[PDB]
Amino acid sequence: TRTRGYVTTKDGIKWYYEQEGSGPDVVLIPDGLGECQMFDKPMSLIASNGFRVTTFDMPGMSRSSDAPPETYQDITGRKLAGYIITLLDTLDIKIASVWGCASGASTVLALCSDYPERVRNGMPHEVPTENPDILLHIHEVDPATISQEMAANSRAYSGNVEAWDALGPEVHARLHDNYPRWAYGYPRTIPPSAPVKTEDLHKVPIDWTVGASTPTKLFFENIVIAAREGINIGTLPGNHFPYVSHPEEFAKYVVETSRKYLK
């Protein structure tokens, strides 16, 4: 029993969102591809443990594509956080345990830094601080090329190609269109704006993760930052999409981690 619906916020974004369960709030912010169907399985699992779980397609992406161009251009964690806060307000969510990978992780940190009152606890996964070589010129090519290149890269970082493929043609068709939009608005601006400064990290509890199979160099700096700052740091099975590759393990982490901070 999950709500699937739409809401147009004051910033003009026509959001597609989902919600399941009752209890303390948990918010699942997608990665840069902004496709919330990736959370379908773990959403129910988390919800079944006594939480109200909310997810949504990101601005300009997938079902939330009816949004103003600025909401998906020159993107930063802080920009996204603003939009999300507006969304939470309309959804009547006061405080939540928040998860997010990549740009979603950047968003989580922005939320913890600038909107601590709304965050129980934050769960960032693979915060981009330095892009790998595959993305260096992605914004410079045409859409068709972007979709071809990015569909491959994503599959390669999937952590489980079988599960990835298993998302289905509808999802993959949505992703096809998301790729160029993500490329033009995310990779150049997300990393330099990473909210990983000292003052961004200590207002609320944070449990940070990197993929177990992810090549060490990719998110190496996340590890060092966390360790030096005294922030809980660890790994999760898979790579960049633990929610897709390892839904069960992912759900257990969210539940167990969020549960620690409940009163």
- For residue 161, state whether it binds a copy of itself (rule: CB under 8 A): no
Distance from C-alpha of 73 to C-alpha of 183, rounded to nearest angstrom: 9
To which residue do tokens 């996964």 refer?
A: 125
- Rounded to whole angstroms, how far apart are CA atoms 162 and 247? 13
Q: Which is nearer to a copy of itself, 36 or 218 (CB)?
A: 218
**Residue 26 backbone phi and psi in degrees, to 5:** -130, 130
CA distances in angstroms from 171 to 33, 37, 159, 175, 180, listed in the order given: 11, 7, 17, 6, 16
The residue from 63, 79, 118, 240 that contacts ligand ZER (CB under 6 A) is 240
- C-beta closer to ligand ZER: residue 39 or 182: 182
Is there binding between residue 182 and ligand ZER (CB under 6 A)?
A: yes
Judged by beta carbon distances under 5 to 8 A according to partner kind, the member of a copy of itself, ligand ZER, none in contact with residue 143 is: none
Binding segment (CB under 8 A) for a copy of itself, from list 106-114, 116-124, 174-182, 229-237: 229-237
Question: Considering beta carbons, is residue 40 or 221 the nearer one to a copy of itself?
Answer: 221
What is the DSSP code (8-state) at residue 28?
E
**Residue 13 contacts by C-beta under 8 Å, 6 or more apart in sequence?**
59, 64, 66, 67, 68, 71, 83, 87
Encode 109-152 in three state secondary structure.
Answer: HHHHHHCHHHEEEEEEECCCCCCCHHHCCHHHCCHHHHHHHHHH
- Within residues 85-114, the interface with ligand ZER by CB under 6 A covers 102-103
228 contacts a copy of itself (rule: CB under 8 A): yes
- Vertex 121 angle, CA 119 and 124, to 5°: 105
Alpha carbon distance 126, 201 (integer Å): 15
Q: Please, what is the minimum distance in Å from the beta carbon of residue 57 to a copy of itself?
A: 29
Contact letters for a copy of itself, residues 109-148 (x by CB under 8 A): ----------------------------------------
Minimum CB separation of residue 91 from ligand ZER in Å reads 23
Strand partners, 209: 125, 234
216 lines the binding site for a copy of itself (CB under 8 A): yes
54: nearest Cα among 111, 98, 118: 98
Q: Please report how close the Cβ of residue 259 comes to ligand ZER at its closest, in angstroms.
A: 27
Per CB under 6 A, the list member of 44, 86, 153, 235 interacting with ligand ZER is 153
Give residues in contact with ligand ZER (CB under 6 A). Answer: 31-33, 102-103, 128, 131-132, 134-135, 153-154, 157, 182, 186-187, 190-191, 240
Give residues in contact with a copy of itself (CB under 8 A). Answer: 210-220, 223-224, 227-228, 233-235
